Each structure stands twice: as structure tokens, then as C-alpha cells.
Amino acid sequence: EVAVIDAIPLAATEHDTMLEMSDMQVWSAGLTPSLVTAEDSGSLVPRGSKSDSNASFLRAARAGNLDKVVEYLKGGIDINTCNQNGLNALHLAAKEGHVGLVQELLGRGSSVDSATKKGNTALHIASLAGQAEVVKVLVKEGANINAQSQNGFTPLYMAAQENHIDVVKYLLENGANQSTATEDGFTPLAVALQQGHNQAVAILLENDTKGKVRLPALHIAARKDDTKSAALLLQNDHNADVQSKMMVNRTTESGFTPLHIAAHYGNVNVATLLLNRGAAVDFTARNGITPLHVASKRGNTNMVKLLLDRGGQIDAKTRDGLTPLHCAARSGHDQVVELLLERGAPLLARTKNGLSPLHMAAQGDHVECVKHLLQHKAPVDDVTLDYLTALHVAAHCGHYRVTKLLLDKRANPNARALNGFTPLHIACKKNRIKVMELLVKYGASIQAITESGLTPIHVAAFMGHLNIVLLLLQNGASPDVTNIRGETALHMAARAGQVEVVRCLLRNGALVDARAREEQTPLHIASRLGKTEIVQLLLQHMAHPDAATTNGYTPLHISAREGQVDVASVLLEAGAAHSLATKKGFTPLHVAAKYGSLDVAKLLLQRRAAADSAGKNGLTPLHVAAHYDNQKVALLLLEKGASPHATAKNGYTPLHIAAKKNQMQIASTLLNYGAETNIVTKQGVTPLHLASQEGHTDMVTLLLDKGANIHMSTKSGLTSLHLAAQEDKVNVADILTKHGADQDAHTKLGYTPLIVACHYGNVKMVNFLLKQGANVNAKTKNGYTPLHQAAQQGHTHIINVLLQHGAKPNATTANGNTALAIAKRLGYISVVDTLKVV
């Protein structure tokens, strides 16, 4: 996979800039007090046999008709009857200010602190509506002055919200607690401050001392620019030496000080007061956001002027290096930018990635910011760490106006970034048509290449940006320029699967059988990736279907390896040769027999492809199939008439191959097709020999079930009981004498399977041998008995068991050599000892 067609850094640098500059945002959630909703008297319709009358009674309460009400009370009407919302007669009377009705209702035994569905007492309803007189009656009758409705609202909160001075002043005098807050954390002070009721704020502040009530109020004052309130709130904040402990520098939950907040909304007036009260100009929140950053991001020109004058660091940088000049520039606040510059903000300050303020302005298509920065002599082609110019960035974003400006300001349209990427390469990758045309007009080289040899047209074709591919061709781009792999735009278009692009290049003269590395054409790549439609397209434009790679693979061979059945079909239907060979001498059928592509194999056999095609090695597809344990494909061939008696150059049949690699199923299938087992190679090898040698227990069983001789000698005189001993095949040999394999059999050098079993130290092997008729006294050609071999190689346990069976130690060779003469010749100390005990 090509990962080289990515300007890898830039998306990920936009994000770093974004999410460390999108996070300078005061969560007004806790600075905007929640406002109470008053209980709407309902239509008061019937909802019981007293249904119509309970409803008629409530309307009488709302209208303040004491007379009609008393008659209902005497008439059997329950005084606690209410509407859908839980509003009773005392609530309705309370809202309208019908004082006399209220005393009367309380007199008739109406529950005072009876609450509605929303938790409103008569006192809540009365306070919000400003019925000071109803309240005096309610307070005096012992109503709960600190009762809370559903969201935590208290009567003092409501009175402050609706600027009912007299109610507030009264509620406070009777010990109402203004510290008691809502669920979202708002106090009567906070809401009075939010509503701009300075008169109410003044009163509330006179009663309570706590900064616990005060701090959230101050933040709100900061947002609302309430200088008058801010001054009052800070009446007790004494100038201390530890700034973070002064109330004016205490933060919200977002780490923002009051000054950050004033900076955000551009509240010069409140900020000035805050600062005069010892506000810290460079207190930081989150990832190093100073107030100066915030005002800068916000374009609050006058705030910036103020913070700088108060000793605010013009060059403070965030965690990734944003200076205030970066921020104003990113946001397109040209007036703030020129100001920061004029106050001497560092013009070429860099972020972690090396972007200057000019790069930020280029991102946001901010013309005026770019003009001011260039005006103050910012290098038009100033580069980042990845060697991107402002022009590279504007092209990636597809920003026309800034691109046009930068080019007019003599930016190099061929400036090469880190990987040779030009602005034109990037514009073509991000499919930026208007920018792309603009760059060409200002002189970008149409056929410049990257460090990996990619041209603009390689890139646009690979990305499928069709309109771009066209424009490049219309501007003279050659579709035959090669990258470092030697691939053209067609190769890259085929690799990506961009069908309409492949067509376009082809209708525009692309060399169809253009050779890349390994001499592979686009037809080869399409076949490998199973791009069926593209295989048809190339073939339609005179692609030679028998074109081979360096190692000799045709697109058909490739179909066989990848199991592309559909691809294989289009090729054969185009006149693809079905029996061409690779450098290793494999036909497409062989390849299918190696990778187990059964559907491809079937399609080939139906096309007059030889089931028994050979190579330089003389191997058929069946041989191959047998080796790689491809059971179905192996079965397919036999049915399509592949000889199981087919031999290679070495002499191996398919049965031979299956025997060695323990291919049970494939071995079974061959035998069912009449595969002879008693057939030898050049050096006298049967599949029975190969099966035994590798120690394939069940395999030797199957070979003898279907007629194999257990006694066939090689050209050196070795049977399969010989080989089962040479490779310590204990299980194999134990089945072989169960079917009668003579041990007495000698080779051409006259050594029996009892000579071999003793030469490699096989204890249990020599035991079972003497158990079916083998003799310890049996000599070889040189004269060696089992005790002559067991005394030569220092086998201690084999001499012991040989002397327990009757191996005479007084036997010589033809030149006169006993077991004791070899054991003394090599210095074996416990071996000369046991030959003189027996």
C-alpha cells in the first residue's frame, strides 16, 4: 500500500490548532441564572358529582369573591379542591392579591404551605407576583419562608427575580435565607444580578456577608458588564499578597477568572474595575489560556488594548504554542492583528509544528490578516517544520481568495514541501478545482514530481478526482510519467479501482501495457486485486492478456493465485492463453493446484486445459496439488482425467508426494483411482518407503491395505523396515513386523535392520526386532554382528540387552576383530568392562 500520497501532517495540525482554540469558550451554563415560570391559572373547567361545582368554586377564588366562596365552603365543597396543576383556592387568591379572601381561607382551615404539582406554596405564588400584603398575612400565619419549589426556588429568589423591592426587603427582615440555592446553584443575589435589578442587588448584599453567595455573582457581573454591582461585590475583597486567594482571581469551574470572562464578552468597563481591584492580567486556564488569548480570539480590540497596557504578555503561548497573534490571525480579526503587531507581537512566533501567524490566517481564508502580516514584512513563503508555505496551507483548504492574494504577493507556486509536495500536488489531492486552475495560471509545474515520483496526475487519478485528471490532460499533463516504482497514472488508477479515471486515461492515450517494476502492466494489478470491470476496460483497449511479469506470471496465473474466478473468466473470453508457463515451469492450472483455487481450476479444465500439463521438473498439477494438501482440486483433476501413475524427473508419482507429507485424504483418493503402490523411482523408492521414513503411522496402514509389498529393497538393498529403524520410527516398525517384514534380509553391504537399530542407540527398537526372529549372531559383510556395532559407538544399554539374548563376545571379523578390540580402540571404560563379565 502507498501511504506516500498523503501530506500526512496537515489535517492533524488543523485539529491541534482547532481543539486548543475551540476550547476558549466560557460555559455560560453557570453564568446565566435560571428564571422562574409563574403558575398559569388554568381555564378552570370541570374535571365526582361536585366536578362542575369544584371548578366553579375555584373561579370564584381567582376573582376574589369572598361571598360566593363562603357559600361553596358551607355547600359541601372541599377547600382543597384543585385544578390539573394542583392550584387550590388559597393559591388563586394569593396570586391576585385578594388579601381579605386569604385571611378568610386560612381562617376556614386552608393548609398554608400546601404545594402545587411544581412545589409552589401560597408564599411562592404571592412573592413572584408582588403581593406584599398577601405575603404579610402568609408570613405571619407561619408559612414556610424557605420552602423550595421543584427546581429549588425559594420565595426570596422569586422576589429578587421580579424586582419586588418591598417583598424582598420584607422577606429578608423575617429571616429568609438568601444563601439557600437552586439545583443549578443559583442564589437570590445571582438572579437579581442577572435581571439587572441593582436596587435588589443592593439590598441583598447588605444582609449577607458570605463570599460563598458572592463569587458566582461576580462572574455574572463580569459577563453582564455590571460595574456598579462588581464594585459592591468587591467591597470586602482586601488587597492580599497571594493573588489566587483574592476573591477577584478566584475561578469558575472552567478555571476562568472574572477577567477571562470580561475578556470574552469584551467588557472593557468591568474589566478595568476588576483590574484596579488587583485582577491578575496573566492568570491561565486549561492549556495556558490567558485573558489576552481570549480577547484576541474574540476580536475584542479594546480589551486587547487594555490587557496589553496592564502588562499582559503579548507573546504568551498556549501548550502548543499559540500566541495571541496566532489566535487573532486564525480568527480573521485584522484590527486586533495589526494592533498586536504594532505593540510588537512576535510576527514569526511558531506553534509546536512551526506555523507562524501567517499560516493561521491562510487557514481561515483571512485576506486582511494576511495583508497586514505581509505588510509588516512576514516572509510570504515562510515555512513550517514540514516546509509548508502559506500557499500550501491555502491550497489544502482550497481557499481561493487567500491563494490569489499570496500568488500576487510573489509566493512560489512551486515551493516544494517536505516530500516534494507542491501546492499543486496538494490542491489536486484535496480535489480543489478552483485553486488548482489558479495555481497553473500562476505557474505551477503541471508535471512536477514528489520525492516518491508522484505527479499531480498520479495523485488526482489515484484519488479518483476525475475533473482534475481531465484538466491536467487538457493542460498538457502526460499520463505516462512514472514514479519510483515505474508505475504510471494508469497503474495507480487500477490499483485504486477508479473506474471512470481508468477510462478517461485510456480515452486520452495512456500506454495500456506500460511496464512498471517487475514488468507488470496495469492489467496485472487489476487481475491481482480482482478489479473485474477494470480488467475488461484494459482488455477493451488492446491490453495483451498474455503479458508476463519478470518471474513469468500472466494475468491468468495471477487469477489462479488470488482465486479471482470472475477475473479468470473475462481473460479466457478475451483469448488468453490457458497453458503458458512461468520461469519455474508452472501453467495457470499448476498455480490453482498450489493455492487451492477450486473455482478457477474448474473454469480452466472446461477450457481444454491439459489436466496433466508438465514443467521442466516434469510435474503435473496433480503433483502440486498433492504436495500442498489441496484436497478438492486434487479430486477434481482425477475426475477430469489426471494419471495417478504420472511420474516426474526424479520418478515420484502423486502417491509418493502424499505419502511423505501425510496427506491422508489425498492419499485415499489416489488409491481409490487405482494408483499403484508398488512402483519405484530411479533410486528404488516406493510410497511405502516415504510414508514409513517420516513416521506416519496411519499412512503406512492405508498403503498396505491396498496392496503394498513390505519387503522391497532399494538399489542399495533397503526395505521400509530398514528406514523405520534409521529414523527411530518405533511405531512404524511395530506395524511392519505385524505384517511380516523379514529382519533376516541383508543389503548389498550385508547389514540387516538389526544393524541400523543398534547404531543410533534405539533400546526398544532392537528389542521388538529380536522378538520376531532376528538373530544377535547374524554377521554382515565385514563380519560385524549386532555386538560388533554396539561396542563401537559406546552403546551401554544395547550391549547389556544383546548379552541377555546370547551374543557371544568371542567372534572375530574377516581380518580378526572382536567386540573387545573396538571398545578398547576408542577408550570406552564401561564397555570393555561388560564384555569380560559375559
Give, in order, the Cα–Cα distances in Å from 65 to each of 39, 92, 97, 118.
20, 11, 12, 26
285 backbone dihedrals φ, ψ, rounded to 5°: -125, 155
Packed helices 211-224 and 268-276: angle between N→C axes, nearest 10 degrees: 140
Q: What's the burial of 500, exposed, middle or buried (CB within 10 Å: 0-12/13-18/19+)?
A: exposed
Cell 581380518 identifies what position?
815
Spatial CA neighbour of 193 closest among 238, 148, 163: 163
Spatial CA neighbour of 329 closest among 286, 299, 291: 299
Q: What letter represents residue 168's amino acid? A: V
- Cα separation of 394 and 390, whole Å? 6
Task: Read off the C-alpha cell for 426.
Answer: 496538494
Q: What letter represents residue 598's amino acid? A: L
Spatial CA neighbour of 407 closest among 355, 367, 462: 367
Long-range contacts: 86-91, Cβ < 8 Å, 24+?
86/115, 86/116, 86/117, 86/118, 87/39, 87/41, 87/42, 87/58, 87/116, 88/58, 88/61, 88/114, 89/57, 89/58, 89/60, 89/61, 90/61, 90/114, 90/122, 91/39, 91/116, 91/120, 91/122, 91/125
- Cα separation of 316 and 333, whole Å? 18
Task: Read off the C-alpha cell for 286.
Answer: 486549561
Secondary structure of 401-422 as H, E, C letters: HHHHHHHHCCCCCCCCCCCCCC
Q: List the chain domain ranges.
A: 1-838
DSSP label of 584:
T
- By three-state DSSP, how is residue 285 classified? strand
Q: What letter represents residue 278's amino acid? A: G
Half-sphere exposure of 175 (CA within 13 A, CB side): 5
Number of other residues whose CB lies within 10 A of the CB of residue 150: 12
- Cα separation of 423 and 426, whole Å? 5
Q: What letter represents residue 719's amino acid? A: T
Number of other residues whose CB lies within 10 A of the CB of residue 720: 32
- Cα separation of 415 and 366, whole Å? 21
- Which technique was used to obtain these atomic coordinates? X-ray
Task: Read off the C-alpha cell for 105.
Answer: 381561607
- Cα separation of 279 and 270, whole Å? 11
Distance, CA of 200 to chain centre: 56
637 backbone dihedrals φ, ψ, rounded to 5°: -60, -45
Decide: 319 and 298 in contact? Cβ < 8 Å: no
- Cα separation of 355 and 373, whole Å? 14
What resolution in Å is listed for this PDB structure?
3.5
- Cα separation of 686 and 736, whole Å? 15
- Cα separation of 144 and 147, whole Å? 6
- Cα separation of 528 and 380, whole Å? 47
